[PDB]
Amino acid sequence: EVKLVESGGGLVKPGGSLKLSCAASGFTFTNYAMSWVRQTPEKRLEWVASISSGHTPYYPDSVKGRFTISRDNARNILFLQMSSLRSEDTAMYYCARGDYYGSVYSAMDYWGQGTSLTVS
Amino acid sequence: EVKLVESGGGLVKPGGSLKLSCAASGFTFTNYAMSWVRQTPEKRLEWVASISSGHTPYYPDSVKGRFTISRDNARNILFLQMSSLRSEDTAMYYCARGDYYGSVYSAMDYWGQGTSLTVS
Amino acid sequence: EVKLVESGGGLVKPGGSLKLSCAASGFTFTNYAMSWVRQTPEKRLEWVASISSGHTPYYPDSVKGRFTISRDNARNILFLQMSSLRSEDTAMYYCARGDYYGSVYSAMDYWGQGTSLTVS
Amino acid sequence: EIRMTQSPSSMYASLGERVTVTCKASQDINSYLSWLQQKPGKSPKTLIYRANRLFDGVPSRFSGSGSGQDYSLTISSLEYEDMGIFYCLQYDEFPFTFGSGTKLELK
Amino acid sequence: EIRMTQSPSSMYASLGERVTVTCKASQDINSYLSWLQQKPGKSPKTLIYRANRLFDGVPSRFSGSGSGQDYSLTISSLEYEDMGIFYCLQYDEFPFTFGSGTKLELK
Amino acid sequence: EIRMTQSPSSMYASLGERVTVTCKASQDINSYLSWLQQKPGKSPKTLIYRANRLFDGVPSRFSGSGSGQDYSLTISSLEYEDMGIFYCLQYDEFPFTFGSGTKLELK
Amino acid sequence: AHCIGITDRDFIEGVHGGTWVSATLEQDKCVTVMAPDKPSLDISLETVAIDGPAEARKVCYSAVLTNVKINDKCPSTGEAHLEEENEGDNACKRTYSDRGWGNGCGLFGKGSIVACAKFTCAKSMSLFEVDQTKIQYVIRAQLHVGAKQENWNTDIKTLKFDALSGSQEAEFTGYGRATLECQVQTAVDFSNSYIAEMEKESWIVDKQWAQDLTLPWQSGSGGVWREMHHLVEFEPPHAATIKVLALGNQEGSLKTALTGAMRVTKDTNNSKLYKLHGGHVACRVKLSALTLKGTSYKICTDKMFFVKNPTDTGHGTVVMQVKVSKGAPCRIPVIVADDLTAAINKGILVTVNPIASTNDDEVLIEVNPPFGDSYIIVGRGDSRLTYQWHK
Amino acid sequence: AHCIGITDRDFIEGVHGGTWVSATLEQDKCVTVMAPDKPSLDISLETVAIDGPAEARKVCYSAVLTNVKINDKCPSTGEAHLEEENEGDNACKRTYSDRGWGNGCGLFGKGSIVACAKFTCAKSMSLFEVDQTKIQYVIRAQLHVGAKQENWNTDIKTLKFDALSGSQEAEFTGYGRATLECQVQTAVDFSNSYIAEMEKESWIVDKQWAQDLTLPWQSGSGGVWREMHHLVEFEPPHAATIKVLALGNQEGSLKTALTGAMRVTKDTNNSKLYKLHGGHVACRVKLSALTLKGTSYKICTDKMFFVKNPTDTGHGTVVMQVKVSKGAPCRIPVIVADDLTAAINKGILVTVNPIASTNDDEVLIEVNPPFGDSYIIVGRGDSRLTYQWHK
Amino acid sequence: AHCIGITDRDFIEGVHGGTWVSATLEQDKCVTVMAPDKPSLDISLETVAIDGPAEARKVCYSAVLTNVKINDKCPSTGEAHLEEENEGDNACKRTYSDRGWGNGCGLFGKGSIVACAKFTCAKSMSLFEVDQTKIQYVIRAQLHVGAKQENWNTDIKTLKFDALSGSQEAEFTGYGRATLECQVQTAVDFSNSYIAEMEKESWIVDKQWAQDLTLPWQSGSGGVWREMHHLVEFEPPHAATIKVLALGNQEGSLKTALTGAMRVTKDTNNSKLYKLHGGHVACRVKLSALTLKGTSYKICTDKMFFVKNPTDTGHGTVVMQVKVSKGAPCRIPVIVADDLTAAINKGILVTVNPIASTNDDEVLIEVNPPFGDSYIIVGRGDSRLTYQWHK
């Protein structure tokens, strides 16, 4: 059995900042790669970020300087720092894992329950 | 179309011999493996022999030393030496190719229409 | 003045043979290349043959062997001899000169009044 | 000589129904197994070649699964066009053989 | 920069029957293609992880197939719990991308 | 092998009307195309021996334009010698070959 | 005979009463055979050929790489892996880079790295093996009847030869029969070699060379390319990432290296039939069954004339076209001599009888005149016809 | 500082009261600057680049041939010509052939023959000339603020330098200023060279090498190709015709020959921006305007702890990441000594003062133990924190 | 009052007023300290240990092979290959075979043949990465209080030691304190090594040895076994078949080679705690802070009685048990001398004063006797108790 669940969602003032996180369980957390995805208010999905099992980060050009993904594998806590949060960043956010060889190039596997984020 | 068509069914005396045969068309026949099978009465389907794309035979003990397969590139014709024939061997025979690599160890795709062999 | 005047077209036996000819005038005939062409009774123009200013012949595969050009530049006369004649052809025949640069690869310059084949 | 069988003598079945067959062997074959179908009066046809995946033109109405000793084929939303004889077949040792046959019938 | 598109779109669909949905990419994605589904509010889940390859626990009733630049999912017979919005996702290229999903419903 | 296909076959136009006619070849011809007329019942005539090249004595009301593979005549005013059959002829490749022809008339 | 036109003739003369003579034929050249009272016979290779030889190998000379993948590991924590490694279709490589906290790496040292890319050949040459038994030869044979050049392509005889159809004969109307033997088992070594095929161009090369080529290759069909190592190379890893070169199309390099190979060509009429350019054969011929057609004829002593003037060959002989007009089936005298007194036929007549077979028709003559000044003479009486010649 | 992640690091130490120092700079490596009572500075060469250098030449490393034409003359009739010969776009060749009656000719001998085909480049590499004036350096430099690993990306100062600029300095808050006079005038000799662009790959090559290349070439203006003889070849004529041979794509050969060149790279963000790989630069640096910021703050030793424990760098100094949560803004002391008695601080401290500037945040520290082995201290009392190290 | 029969039981005596002494310990033994007017101490290594080192790599010392599959090609018919050859997981090997017409072949010569089988590890060792910072030292200490042997297990001290906690202090009720100061930097080099485990048995060995193993091996996390061709071997082909051999369990061979490696064991309780034998370390101790608890107490001079008579230690000293039936917080005089005149206590009292702490319980006493004959003496007055002793 494995489970992921999100934390740190809600509301911040536009231009503001947060540090989202996930607690994850049931797998040897070092071995997996992990990633984040949005479900927009448009109900259109989007990729946010990923980190290798080799502890290396990846981002799309939509957020290259804005977010930072990171994790502590010994405590198996995953983190997502954010800043400059604009209106368009208001969405549902989910985190997920890749595979046991854990390159970011991976069909993603299980997703958390999600947490929302908003600005006003 | 890829096609097989059997020939040389009929009736013979026990202990006699026959040419069972089939024609193949629609593909580079030399490169495929080829195989022979039958349905007996009592509604069972049974392998009898196969040959590699390399001219090389494989046999069950039910038929070992009774028969041989052969084939030609010259005409893409199968032959099967129905020989020392014995009462159980009355069946609808069929042949059904093999695989792209010329393995005898494979599933196989396409089946000829078959032909009835009978013995008095 | 570029008057060009075919001769010898007429009836022939199937499987027979004939030698056509044409007379040129008014230009230094040796310099030009020339071609023979047949207007089909259903009005399809078709190339018959061509000849270089170097006496190098050219033919479509459809008359290979059966037809040949030759030329007599001591008298400004063209010849086209042909054999195994077949009612696949009963065209009007014409001939033409090419470039003054004298090469097979030219458009047609001017055409003679023609003479027609028939086969029976 | 691998022994194997699937149990059903036949399936009586109906338009739009889901129906299945399952086979068991004497050795832990490597999923080098196929399922074969034969409507009467004509030759067999091969649906699924490696035990998980189809040859061309075989419709999504069919699928199959298994591992080691144990395998199955399933039909989703059966039609009368699919009726008739069924067979499995092993092919990872040279006494190639089909086990028990079975058949599919309209109710 | 990849993009993806579905020729279908959010629709009603004949519950109990087979259903089909289809996608095309900017280019060859070498079957690095996955399919996924959502029901409103609750978190999405994965269905297909390469063309013609499935997780455990996902129903054998699904299968999707394709090659090169375009691909399609089917279910061989629909269910009331399984009609929802379906999404497709390539994961070969540096920025990952989703193809715009299709709803399913019936009265 | 080479093939030509002139587009019209049977157009009609008024005395002094402006008309375009055109042909595509089966491959590159690099403008080694010519345009020819047969006035009915008498020996043919030569019009243009490469696109953008008036043959001698051909009046300036004839013209034509070309590409790698598709080419056309245009006639600015169909003066009364217009009536006849017009042919394209490629000569880049030694099996020289002709268009269908195309007629023109008043009635 | 057509051998007049070839850039090079070899002459051979049979000993009197010799049943056989032998010759070596090579495609750029042809042979003429003299014998003391028999019509002269000329022979040549048209082609040597192979039919549908079997695929030995295919070799790529260009490829294109895509879907490039990377994975990494923190230095002490393990060894990097990627699913694509496990199948050759993805042309993998493995290496190490240092990483440290600047890379976000949890410790300092050499991290493991792997990378892969989908490989496809863009353009590939093919190879085929020489079944020596499948070789064919074609020999062109013609007789110096003195038939008009315009007729040569219809009079010329074409003979097939095969490793197990090793003897053949030809017949010439009235001139009799000729029979030929040739070294189909032995004339070439080429079972040691492959035919090499590119787009519309081809060579023959030994198997060892091809097997030594440092390039990726495939065999049979559809199987994974067995030797990715050379055409793809990866940079040193950089900034804990990597990207991958591809070498350019090696086509030019390969086609340069083949400049020493013998060339091969394709029959446009038969995609299976390959014609090999530059082969040679050894051959032997029965002259015995020939005869001089017109020998019984009279001399004309009547006013013939040149259709085409006496003219130089490529080979120091000379040729003529002459026709008799009023006359008969006739043999016409031809003499080459020091003086118009014509004391001796100083030189050699090559068409051993010039025959006017009918009053309508010219006949073609060849003679080998002596060195220095001489007169060509043809016919007799004041109706004689003559021409000066030099060496 | 970002510089900690560089694999190759070396130290320059300024003489006391040297208001200037200097450093030599190379993309593969970094320099760290020490002075007796100053915040340490790290310096690294960043991208060296040109935007939109001017086209010198284009070279077609592949071409294709079509519409091939042939024309011929009988030997007496003088020199052959052709219409298509009239323009260079058809890459003509002229030669002589045998002719004779055996190929329908009027006379035997060498005859004139000519051939053409339209020539089109399939793929071309381009060349662009180096304006030394347009050389733009970028340089990365950063003080040992002791900033978190992460904050490096935001503290880092990125400056551009060029033949139009002497210094364009920046300030570090509280730590003051350093002026930077770079050797923009002198560092490279590339005025003699082209940037070579292939498909998504590029090189720097000297003008002589490039101009000496035999493949057919064209001006930067795109004028008609000059030298097709080096790409197109012709068979010796057969009496009827010449086959024309296109040599293969040469890029594999050329990319092999280029292996000795320095590599060059395209930017995707501006296709005209080209980046030079592996360049050198040097600079003169003022240190006197630097400041040790933290001296005002206290020493509290107030129950500090590691966020990440001490560890060896890639470059033989050691580093650690620590916080005083709660407590106060403070500058806790650090030493490495011979013994736990800590008689002498036998090795060198590499960043002089931490600053616990807010009660929630951590600090990163660096130290240089002496050769052999030595003991490290931070804090005071029995409550101080410690470790052990080799050289 | 500790260390019954220990394989070594050596003494270190401090200089008077020396705050520190140093000791080197090895898990076989203990070392006891004399402080010239302070209670004697003793110390020993219980273990050195690692918890949960990283699961980097696995190696199969045995495997089983199944469903070996084969096919073939006649010598001209290209080359044999089979689906499994393109993938992994099947340890494939391929080679040429003789074939001929009598084998049913079309032709005589080298055909080609391919063979593969599913490979699965039967039994495997695992390897794990040591982190030096994850090394722990656990040191026992006990002070020579004379406590009852049974009470030793409740008296005994243990301290953790590691590089991040290089100092600790023992405390003894009424007996004061002593600091201890372990040394990490030069004890052990396990950074170059793996822990290796098979079946409840394990060793430490260097990484390079493990890298050099001929056996096939597996990633920490996946299914792609990597070098099966070391374990499997293929017979030379027969005309249409090969039989393939699995070598037996190499375990014994492997375990023979490890016979020189240092042994390791798992804890029963924490399966991830590995406890390493053969360990040794250096340490320092503050002696000064100890206390003589009862030197002020009443001297007994009374009829005590023995509970375990004077008996020889593993080395040198004599030990005994005694108690006081009626008494107090009391103390017992002890002397060892040449003569019952007891002119000098020629030997050394090791528990520097055995206070009879209570009416409840016995006390242990330890004495170093002189060489030769001597008398043990305990108590005073005519009430004293005595026995003979030697060397």
UniProtKB/TrEMBL annotation, chains G, H, I:
Q: Where in the cell is it found?
A: Host cytoplasm, Host perinuclear region; Host endoplasmic reticulum membrane; Host nucleus; Secreted
Specify the domain of life of the species encoding this protein.
Viruses
Subunit structure as annotated in this protein's UniProt entry: Homodimer; in the endoplasmic reticulum and Golgi. Interacts with protein prM. Interacts with non-structural protein 1. Forms heterodimers with envelope protein E in the endoplasmic reticulum and Golgi.
Query: Briefly, what is this protein's role?
Result: Induces the formation of ER-derived membrane vesicles where the viral replication takes place. Inhibits interferon (IFN)-induced host STAT1 phosphorylation and nuclear translocation, thereby preventing the establishment of cellular antiviral state by blocking the IFN-alpha/beta pathway. May play a role in virus budding. Exerts cytotoxic effects by activating a mitochondrial apoptotic pathway through M ectodomain. May display a viroporin activity.
Q: What protein name does the entry list?
A: Genome polyprotein
Gene source species? Yellow fever virus
- Recall the taxonomic lineage recorded for the source organism: Viruses, Riboviria, Orthornavirae, Kitrinoviricota, Flasuviricetes
The shown residues of the full protein are 278 to 668 of 3389
